[PDB]
Design a protein around this ligand. Structure first.
Ligand code: HEM
Ligand SMILES: COc1ccc([C@]2(c3ccc(F)c(-c4cccnc4)c3)N=C(N)N3CC(F)(F)CN=C32)cc1C
Length: 460
């Protein structure tokens, strides 16, 4: 019942209730709680996720020490959630030297050179995305962005990792499509996870009953799906193909190889489509930003020319529109690290087992670093204004050795989708569009109502 930790230390924060802690304050969500705590407590504050003491830091020097400097020795592991089970072998969940092994062995997969070879693969789905969005625009009916971008994101992740050319939108009942679509992003403010946070003693009980956080139906499917394509489909000798090539400390396990595949699908599907939905909302509400972006795409690629690896990186304003969307809408919301030993960083003392939190959303909207944070201004990320942006304040893909391994991959496929979509179409606010768009009160950064926009074809 550790509740007098921040009182003894002299760190401010909200008054905790027995057993529950400060979970009642989450009725507004993770984002609204951090924004309110940052304004009344200041630079450093502490709260309780049931019985778990969580310390939040906002100083850039402290963030650098937690994420970059004292990473390998002190802040190596993330917060342990519900009954993970077999999936404990996944890069994002794995802790200590186990993670070090999986990081080094999976680092050459996300190289700049290997990303060039992945470019023509996701390019064929860019045409498919345009082909599918054409029929939805020809009708004149309102277009649901998450379904269109989701279907695109679904066939992009499956294609990069062994065959599966399957048109996800036109084939919604394919064994691969339907099962991978069931992989729902974990909401940590739902009744299940709230019970796990308040009662951590339930985790060993659920682990012995084989009750897993990840759905049993999909995990059993993907394990046998990966097993058959590795052998039965391609037995003849000449992300999955890159992993088979890798199969100091190697020894890649077949069970671990399955866990890594589920993670790339999980991180790929839900996140890419959610960011792509947020960006198109901002481009429709600001037609001047959309026109300027469409003028830049045509300047680099004349007469609807297909994009390439070197072409994507050349576009300045495209990067500015992506960066400003991720600024206003960081899908991660928070950056957490567990303190393993009693140490002190930049004067501030950190005990043991205390979850060190970095409130990305709150820091991304801090008036001390951003001029008019509520407003969407891509001009912040221009060659002249980019110097003013602190790399430890703006963290959409994190920082240090435990940062996003697929940040270059996610950016590449999102921009490639944006290029094709804006080359052939113009986006305008529909009759039932929420202006201003209000975020969900749950544990997921997504809109309250799905983003619906009227899509007009660029001269059919
Ligand atoms: C819009 C797209 C994405 C965003 C905004 C995003 C964001 C993040 C963030 C904020 C983290 C946490 C880093 C930290 O704790 O400091 C993270 C971790 C990670 N992301 Fe992404 N990510 C995205 C897409 C992806 C994709 C497509 C992949 C896979 C190809 C991926 C794989 C990972 C992995 C494996 C980690 C954990 C790294 C580790 O513990 O070593 N992410 N991502
Ligand atoms: C596939 O299912 C998941 C696996 C790991 C994590 C995540 C997580 C958190 C935040 C994130 F931002 C991402 C993420 C999302 C998209 C791409 N890459 C990483 C994953 N990874 C870890 N270690 N934890 C422990 C936690 F902090 F208690 C809660 N959330 C996470 C989240 C989910 C949904």
């Amino acid at each position: 019942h550790s509740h007098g930790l921040f009182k003894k230390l002299g760190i401010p924060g909200p008054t905790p209730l027995p057993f529950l802690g400060n979970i009642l304050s989450y009725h507004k969500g993770f984002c609204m709680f951090d924004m309110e705590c940052h304004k009344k407590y200041g630079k450093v504050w502490g709260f309780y996720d049931g019985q778990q003491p969580v310390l939040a830091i906002t100083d850039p020097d402290m963030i650098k020490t937690v994420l970059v400097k004292e990473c390998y020795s002190v802040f190596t592991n993330r917060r342990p959630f519900g009954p993970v089970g077999f999936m404990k072998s996944a890069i994002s969940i794995a802790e200590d030297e186990e993670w070090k092994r999986l990081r080094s062995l999976l680092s050459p997969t996300f190289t700049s050179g290997k990303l060039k070879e992945m470019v023509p693969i996701i390019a064929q789905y860019g045409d498919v995305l345009v082909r599918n969005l054409r029929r939805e625009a020809e009708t004149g009916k309102p277009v649901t962005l998450k379904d269109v971008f989701g279907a695109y994101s679904m066939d992009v992740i499956t294609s990069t990792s062994f065959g599966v050319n399957i048109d996800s939108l036109n084939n919604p009942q394919d064994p691969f499509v339907e099962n991978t679509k069931k992989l729902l992003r974990f909401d940590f403010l739902d009744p299940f996870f709230l019970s796990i946070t308040v009662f951590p003693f339930l985790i060993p009980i659920l682990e012995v009953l084989n009750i897993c956080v990840f759905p049993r139906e999909v995990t059993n499917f993907l394990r046998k799906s990966v097993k058959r394509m590795k052998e039965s489909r391609l037995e003849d000798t000449q992300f999955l193909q890159l992993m088979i090539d890798s199969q100091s400390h190697k020894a890649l396990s077949d069970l671990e190889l399955v866990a890594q595949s589920i993670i790339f699908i999980f991180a790929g599907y839900e996140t890419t489509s959610s960011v792509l939905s947020f960006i198109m909302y901002e481009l429709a509400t600001h037609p001047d930003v959309q026109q300027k972006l469409q003028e830049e795409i045509d300047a680099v690629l004349p007469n609807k020319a297909p994009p390439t690896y070197d072409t994507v990186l050349q576009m300045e304003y495209l990067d500015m529109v992506v960066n400003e969307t991720l600024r206003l809408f960081p899908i991660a919301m928070r950056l957490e690290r567990v303190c393993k030993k009693d140490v002190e960083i930049n004067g501030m003392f950190i005990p043991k087992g205390v979850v060190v939190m970095i409130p990305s959303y709150a820091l991304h909207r801090d008036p001390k670093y951003w001029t008019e944070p509520e407003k969407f201004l891509p001009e912040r990320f221009s060659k002249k204004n980019k110097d003013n942006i602190d790399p430890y304040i703006y963290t959409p893909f994190g920082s240090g050795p435990r940062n996003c391994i697929g940040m270059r991959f996610a950016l590449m496929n999102m921009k490639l989708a944006l290029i094709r979509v804006l080359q052939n179409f113009s986006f305008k606010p529909c009759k039932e569009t929420q202006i201003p768009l209000k975020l969900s009160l749950g544990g997921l950064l997504q809109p309250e109502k799905p983003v619906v926009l009227k899509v007009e074809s660029r001269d059919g």
